[PDB]
Design a protein around this ligand. Sequence first.
Ligand code: ZN
Lengths: 64, 365, 250, 781
Amino acid sequence: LETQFTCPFCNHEKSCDVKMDRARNTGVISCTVCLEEFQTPITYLSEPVDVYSDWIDACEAANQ
Amino acid sequence: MLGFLSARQTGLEDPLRLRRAESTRRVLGLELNKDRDVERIHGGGINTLDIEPVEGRYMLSGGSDGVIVLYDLENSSRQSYYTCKAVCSIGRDHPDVHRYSVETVQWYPHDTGMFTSSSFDKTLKVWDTNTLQTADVFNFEETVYSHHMSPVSTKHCLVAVGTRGPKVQLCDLKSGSCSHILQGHRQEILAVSWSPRYDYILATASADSRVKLWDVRRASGCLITLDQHNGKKSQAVESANTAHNGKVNGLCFTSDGLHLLTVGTDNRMRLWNSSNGENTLVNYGKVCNNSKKGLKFTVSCGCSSEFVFVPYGSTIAVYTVYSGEQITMLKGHYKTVDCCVFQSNFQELYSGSRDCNILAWVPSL
Amino acid sequence: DAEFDEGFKVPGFLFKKLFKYQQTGVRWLWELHCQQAGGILGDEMGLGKTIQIIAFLAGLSYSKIRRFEGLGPTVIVCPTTVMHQWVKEFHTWWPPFRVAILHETGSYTHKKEKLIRDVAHCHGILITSYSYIRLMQDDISRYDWHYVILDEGHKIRNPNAAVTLACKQFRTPHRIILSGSPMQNNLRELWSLFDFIFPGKLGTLPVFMEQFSVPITMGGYSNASPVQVKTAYKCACVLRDTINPYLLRR
Amino acid sequence: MSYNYVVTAQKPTAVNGCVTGHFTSAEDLNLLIAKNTRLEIYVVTAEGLRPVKEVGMYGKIAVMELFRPKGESKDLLFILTAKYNACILEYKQSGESIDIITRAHGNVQDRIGRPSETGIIGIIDPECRMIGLRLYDGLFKVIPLDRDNKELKAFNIRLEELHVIDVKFLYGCQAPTICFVYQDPQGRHVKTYEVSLREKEFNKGPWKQENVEAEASMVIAVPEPFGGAIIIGQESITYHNGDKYLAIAPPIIKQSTIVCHNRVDPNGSRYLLGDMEGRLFMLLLEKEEVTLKDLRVELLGETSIAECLTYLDNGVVFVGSRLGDSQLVKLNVDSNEQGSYVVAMETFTNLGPIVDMCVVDLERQGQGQLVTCSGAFKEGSLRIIRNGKLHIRTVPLYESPRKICYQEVSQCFGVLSSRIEVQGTTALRPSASTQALSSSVSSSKLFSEEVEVHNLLIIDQHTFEVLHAHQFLQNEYALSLVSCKLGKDPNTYFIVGTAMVYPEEAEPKQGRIVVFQYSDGKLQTVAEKEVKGAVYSMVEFNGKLLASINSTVRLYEWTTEKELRTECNHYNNIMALYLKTKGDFILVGDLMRSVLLLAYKPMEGNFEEIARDFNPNWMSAVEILDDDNFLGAENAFNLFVCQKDSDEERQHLQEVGLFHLGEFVNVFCHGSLVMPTQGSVLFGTVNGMIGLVTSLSESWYNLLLDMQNRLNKVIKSVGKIEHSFWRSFHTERKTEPATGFIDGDLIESFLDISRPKMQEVVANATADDLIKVVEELTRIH
DNA sequence: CTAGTTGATCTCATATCAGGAGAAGGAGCAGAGCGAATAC
Ligand SMILES: [Zn+2]
């Protein structure tokens, strides 16, 4: 499972970094290029793929 | 100021004096707008703004969510408080919406019936403003960081595009020829800007810490390479003659086009003689920027002294171009400011930032 | 004497000798010289393209336009079989050009490097063969040539040949090609010629192929789907107007 | 679309430039005077001036200089227009016929560029190798003359110094050498360059930059025997030649800055220098055997406030003035027993800056009469104008008038005036405010170098003597004045809007509206009202007082208690500078939003923004022509007529008429100077022109338009300037052709052509019909 | 000297799971130790 992801907003490969703040149960995914940021709740079973998942889902939901 | 009015009435001073002095005074009194608001439609940060060059009424805004919003800035209501309503919108439901962030949007000069928008989806789309449909699309092999149409060209209608490729593309809007490229950079071309003075002069700033001026008619590469030291540290041109000690992510010709303001990721802005690229050694102090993409900043027009409005963190730093003296910080944004566009008719400013807000700064009183 | 817009005094006693298309070609060449770009005199054989070149260079020398007080050192790369013809043409149109041939036959009777140095030192008119460009490609390109004229420039039709690389190692903005046909087999040759005259105008050859050559040939077949032929027509139009101001073909 | 007819009732009278030389003939000593659009050529006789020609340029003459190229029998005249039409003209007299042939012409407007602060500068190399223009910051345009052009092809040389104060060509230099004073953050410095036409670029000057006085504002190129230059500043006069550095600081020039100069002798042994206060000094260069020994300045005397001056001969000096009457003065060898060597020989009338003017039917005739606040500080006056030619009286006030209004019931004019006191305070001269029959000072309970003292002068409208002079509070500027009766009481009042002016602020925060009544030869303060800003403009609006405090247009009612009570306000203005009225409608001229058609809805009791123009025109004056036509004057010397169109788009005023007047209109007023056209709006300008706007009918306007095009095809302009270009609406960020306006001067020129040219005009009715039409058009003024 | 013939050589162009063991790097934690920094 890759940790760096293509940004849904600027389509820059591996430009998204994921930070797991487990102490606060929050994952923050940020694109280095276009500076888009997204915050989602996470669990101890969560992974950066799950945070990027929640980001893609939030984008598609907001774009309806 | 009653002295100014009296001098204008009595012919002591040219009306030019009152006009430019009052423009400068208005710019100095720039403050968060007391009675004005801008409609919020972008779901993501606004990366770019552009007020149309003719009549200065309509404003384009490209968001990080790929939508393009067209606002009317005129207060068509009778109240002193109004919101800049959104006339049109390339929203998520438009068949031609950009799939990724719109990074530059520009009105067609000489006419408001067309505009252009480049995105990180590797497309420069040319839109008919009336039908709001894509009149043309130019696809690129690599993401677009910036683009610019000449604000002066009555003859050519080239769009200079800077992508992550090391080549500056020149897309002819006259019969579509995107094959023309300029060689000489080595990394992503983060900013491009046509000279407002000279028709065929284009300045390009790239991540290789170099700024090059090209005569696009010419067959022999760039005209000038900007050098910080002008020759104090002189070396055979392979890696020397850098404009900055980092990525040069913003360009802006001054109003007359005789100087060039370059902002780079070394936390420095520099002013260059646009005719021979000599550094004028204007200080400006430290200009905080760490943007990994192009940084959009503008200069004032029609004032006694020229000003430059640079995004500075979550603020707008206003500097005097030719002295470097720091005027002020416009402080009303909650995240880093991506773009600021200057309305020259009324000395107004519109700033878009990552907080999904377009804030209007108006002169006080 | 005929005078152009910015001032390019082509002499009357030469300009009167040209034909209407020849004078148009001189006008076009000098427009290129003002834009500091190169071109292709793609006029087919028999019209007379050397006469246009000598007339234009003679006007550029007498007009004393300036870098260089008038015309500087120019190199003409032509097949051997016409080299002597070229010098005679100069000597009958514009005598005061110190024209010199670089060849084993030649007239220098000394070291050829000394000939290059001496001719450049006098801003002369130096004629070579393509082979000498290839062999002395490092030596001949050190003396700040002001013009490069590849007569029968279809020798550059291959973007791989060592002659193409040696000819593209020149530095001047001024690159003129005298070829009866810019392309002979396919668009590789058009791209190579345009990479010579104007390094940046047409894109890198991969880009050029993928945009122009494949769609055009795919639309050159009668079993092509209608979309294919329409795209081929559009791309041909784009290539045509892109090359319009730099290929003068009659 | 609107239909308007503009005609010049009185040609411009303010002189903005005067040059002497041999223009008409090799032996004649010509005086060329540039009034704004008019070039007047006189021949300097032994006595006075003999007018030989008067041509009307299609342009505001910003530069006017005479130069004699090698081989030319007589001087050629270089004229640059404010819209940057350059022309080289020659005088060709063929017997009775006089022609100003355009030897060369062109347009030198750069498409983009910051116009320089100190204004357009035009200089000519003393050997006439080139013309150097400073039009924009950072650039120096050069028009070579050795290359004989008929199109005046020019090239810009980039000038590293961006704030150039003044520039001249030095004398006795092998190469064209410019010496100029420029301002950088380190101070003001005088630098030199040697222009190269072959390389088209500057080269290192004969002598390096030298740091000059902070207010060093003038450069004077001394002729060959001395060479170098003289820099005049506010406090000192210095002379540089590269190693000679002479300097003086005469205390007598400290009081006022020197604004003009002229060279008396061909060798520059003497110069004239005029200051803004009118003082004329002689700067003498003492030579030593040649180099320069020492500089002296001696006060010759006092003249009108000189924009320019020119020594003709025999001690005669033409003092050309913009703020007062131009003068022809004599420099006596010996003093006049008052310390002054200057004696006025002749005075040429100048309607100075016409800041305000009122049309009055004085003498109870059917004829109008313009009473204009003309002139400035020392040259301020009232001018009374009638049709008799135009007869112009003059009532010298010796202080600047600002506003004027006529009170028919009281048989007097209320005139706002302003004088300068130096120190508590002392008047520099006995002014009309101080020479009133009776006087008073405001004692207001509301509020508790050189300064301006403002007064309300009650002036008898028979003898034009100052019946009264009421001085205002300390540091109070009176801005507006209106004579009207408010509410329902019968008394007629002088209502004065004021502002409290202190140096610590940029916009007045305090002011008051004072209601005076003039009765029994006394000016009693009937009422006061402290307001929170400068009352820029006031007007009577249906018996109420419509005032404009800094950004708020508000309405006051006159109560039974004889006090002003606010009724309604409108705040959607930057600064409402100009107010006009017709019925329930108000026209608010804004500083930079340019118009606002407001309506007072009486059934409710507030204002309603009926419409607005969203174009950013900076206003100088505004007027209401018809129920739906609104005339306005922009500070860029343009007239524009807005029209209420026919949704929210109904709130957009449409600019249905555009025109470039070439004059800074200060005031409009309904009225006519005479006993086919609808309406009559006179206007007064800064350069002294009085013009007249009338509305035309559609078919007639179309026919006139056709005549204008025909005349443009026939009549040849002096500088080969196209009339459409000259009248094209022009602003630094906009340029449009003229629409909805007929140039009355061009139409009236239809009389001054011969019959074959008329037939050329009227190729496609007969010529006599159009002669009748233009005669009827001339009747209105 | 001096041109014409003879071979070699190069370029260019013609299409279509039931390993294991050890050594080197990097990671995260743990503490020790010393500079500054409040503060009694
Ligand atoms: Zn991104």
